[PDB]
Amino acid sequence: MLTCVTSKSIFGITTENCPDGQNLCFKKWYYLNHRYSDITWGCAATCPKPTNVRETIHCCETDKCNE
């Protein structure tokens, strides 16, 4: 099984066991003119493709790799 970060903050780091078939962790955010969106973390079955040029998406395959 795989375990991924699902949210991270100064109050703590949350992880979750991915269900069968979701064998990737991801981390994503958007950037525009020196502003960043909130970061999103989770499990996924396929690496989501960026919906636009402002999005950065990073996927990986081992426990807690998406921190």
Side-chain angles (χ1 to χ4, degrees):
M1 51 173 297
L2 177 64
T3 297
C4 301
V5 177
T6 57
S7 82
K8 187 174 168 166
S9 86
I10 52 183
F11 326 105
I13 298 163
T14 298
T15 59
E16 310 220 17
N17 303 326
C18 311
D20 292 327
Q22 298 174 34
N23 47 20
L24 303 166
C25 307
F26 74 85
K27 183 183 192 179
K28 62 185 282 316
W29 67 87
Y30 299 86
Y31 173 89
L32 173 74
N33 297 319
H34 309 286
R35 292 190 165 77
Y36 293 77
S37 71
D38 289 341
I39 298 157
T40 300
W41 290 268
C43 299
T46 78
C47 193
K49 279 320 173 55
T51 56
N52 64 53
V53 68
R54 299 181 297 275
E55 193 173 21
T56 287
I57 170 85
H58 289 137
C59 296
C60 53
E61 319 80 3
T62 53
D63 288 337
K64 298 178 283 193
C65 62
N66 62 329
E67 195 188 343

